[PDB]
């Protein structure tokens, strides 16, 4: 009665029709218990260092600091020049540049040859 909801990279898969939520093994119960334990301990540390009346500054999350240091400063190490990296670099860095370069050569050669003929609409073209 329904084509079973093909997913995509944009359409998220909702929590109802997984259908992996219904094959509950003991490993999934173990993983959900340990995940609740991790969230419990993190909320405990955060709430104890969040409700202190002497605490003046910010709580200084290492998660945001770690993500930012991974995002900006930890790119250039580490790296190796692979076939995929070099290929995508020379494609998305040089391709559009040389393409736009050739098409502006074409447009400029058209306009230069055409006004060298003199038959352009520059009867008054003062604001050059």
């Amino acid at each position: 009665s329904f084509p079973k909801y093909e997913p995509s990279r944009l359409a998220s898969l909702p929590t109802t029709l997984d259908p992996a939520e219904y094959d509950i093994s003991s490993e999934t119960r173990k993983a959900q218990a340990e995940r609740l334990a991790i969230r419990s301990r993190l909320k405990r540390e955060y709430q104890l260092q969040y409700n202190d009346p002497s605490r003046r500054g910010v709580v200084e999350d290492p998660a945001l600091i770690r993500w930012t240091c991974a995002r900006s400063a930890n790119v250039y190490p580490n790296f190796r020049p692979n076939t995929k990296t070099s290929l995508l670099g020379a494609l998305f860095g040089i391709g559009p540049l040389i393409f736009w370069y050739y098409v502006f050569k074409t447009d400029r050669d058209r306009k230069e040859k055409l006004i060298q003929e003199g038959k352009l609409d520059r009867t008054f073209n003062i604001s050059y």
Partner: protein, 459 residues
């Protein structure tokens, strides 16, 4: 002009022989007096430049930039406290005298006559900025920032000296009129191509162009506020001033040899507006915005229309004020929280309910709100480049759209929607930062009323 040079000297021993709680009023008061003193300059008329000596003169390109420099100094000097007021007295005096010597070589550079004197004062403009950003770089890679900075600017600006000495001993002296009144066209031999490439490439380094724009972002994210404002406004528009002067020579080959640089500038303007849509480190978004506006500047310089040069100098002055202001607001936010990141400091429509007015005003000038000068600049550059080619307007408008979106994202990311409610240390807005905003955005609107001053030599 020595009437402006020598009090800028005599403002330096002032700072030495004033004491604690006594340097400050002296420096700020007297620098504002020098701002009035160069507001007296604007006399320039009609036929030519005005010659303040056998040695100095002023084109009308140089007058608004010089007034902008002497306007920007006291603003900067008040801006650079609360992050060094708790440091030592001798080091604070050394900082202030470093800025004064910096301004002095900037006046030296803008009021040049000979291009060799211009080059000496170009790298004399360079050397205080280095010392400021390295001594108070305030982050762990100020080492690499200063190193990249000095080696890019010198090693790009190094063969410029050789090309200018060659022009010196093939065409007589190097007064700008005797560079004019005697210049003859030079054909398409490859030595002419390398000479043009040397001069234009040194100033390409100093704009920056797109292939050498990673000079910039470390040198602004790891700089203090004074060196950042100096660097952005006065040094990038000084590089544009230099290319605007020395593009008088070598016009018969710039058409044949200017094709790759325009395309690099256009596609890199698109790529730079794209790259400042998604980054963290909010301080760097203004730096990539500056790369975008200077790419538009370089398009305007390599096309050689009077329309293009008027739009170029208006874009220079408006973007200088916008970038210096917006750097100062980013320093205000970093004084609030010790983050420098973008997604952390949020809220602030409730709290500090008039700081948001200055963020909105800066964001709409960076939008180029239409009575402002930035839209005047961008509009005349788009007009001149559409007369250049009937096709480049796709890139200009797509720059306009992405510029609107990242400037608006800067506005409504950090200062819209919800405070993170674990901040609880931000103070209400001081009188000082509000005074700095008021010193920024009164002259921009007052030139928005009457902008016939700031247009270039081809008025």
């Amino acid at each position: 002009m020595l009437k402006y040079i020598i009090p800028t000297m005599m403002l330096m021993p002032l700072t030495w022989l004033s004491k604690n709680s006594m340097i400050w009023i002296n420096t700020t008061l007297h620098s504002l007096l020098i701002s009035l003193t160069s507001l007296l300059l604007l006399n320039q008329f009609g036929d030519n430049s005005l010659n303040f000596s056998l040695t100095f003169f002023s084109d009308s390109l140089s007058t608004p930039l010089l007034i902008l420099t002497m306007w920007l100094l006291p603003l900067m000097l008040m801006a650079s406290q609360h992050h060094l007021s708790k440091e030592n007295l001798a080091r604070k005096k050394l900082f202030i005298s470093m800025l004064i010597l910096l301004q002095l070589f900037l006046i030296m550079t803008f009021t040049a006559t000979e291009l060799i004197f211009f080059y000496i004062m170009f790298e004399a403009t360079l050397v205080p900025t280095l010392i400021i950003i390295t001594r108070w770089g305030n982050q762990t890679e100020r080492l690499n920032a200063g190193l990249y900075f000095l080696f890019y600017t010198l090693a790009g600006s190094l063969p410029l000296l050789v090309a200018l000495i060659y022009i010196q001993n093939t065409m007589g002296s190097l007064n700008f009129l005797i560079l004019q009144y005697w210049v003859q066209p030079m054909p398409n031999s490859w030595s002419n191509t390398f000479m043009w490439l040397a001069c234009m490439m040194a100033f390409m380094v100093k704009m920056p162009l797109y292939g050498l724009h990673l000079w910039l972002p470390k040198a602004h994210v790891e700089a203090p506020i004074a060196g950042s404002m100096v660097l952005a406004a006065i040094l990038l528009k000084l590089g544009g001033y230099g290319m605007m002067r020395i593009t008088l020579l070598l016009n018969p080959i710039t058409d044949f040899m200017a094709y790759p640089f325009i395309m690099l500038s256009l596609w890199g303007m698109i790529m730079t507006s794209s790259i400042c849509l998604r980054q963290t480190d909010l301080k760097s978004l203004i730096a990539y915005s500056s790369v975008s506006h200077m790419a538009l500047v370089i398009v305007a310089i390599l096309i050689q229309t009077p329309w293009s040069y008027m739009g170029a100098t208006a874009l220079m002055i408006a973007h200088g004020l916008t970038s210096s202001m917006l750097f100062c607001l980013a320093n205000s936010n970093y004084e609030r929280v010790h983050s420098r990141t973008m997604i952390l400091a949020r809220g602030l429509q409730t709290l500090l309910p008039l700081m948001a007015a200055w963020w909105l005003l800066a964001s709409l000038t960076n939008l180029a709100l239409p009575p402002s000068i930035n839209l005047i600049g961008e509009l005349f550059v788009v007009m001149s480049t559409f007369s250049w080619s009937n096709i480049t307007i796709i890139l200009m408008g797509l720059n306009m759209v992405i510029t609107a979106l990242y400037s608006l994202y800067m506005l409504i990311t950090t200062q819209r929607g919800k405070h993170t409610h674990h901040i609880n240390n931000i103070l209400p807005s001081f009188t000082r930062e509000n005074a700095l905003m008021s010193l920024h955005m009164l002259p921009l609107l007052l030139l928005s009323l009457n902008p016939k001053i700031i247009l270039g030599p081809l008025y």
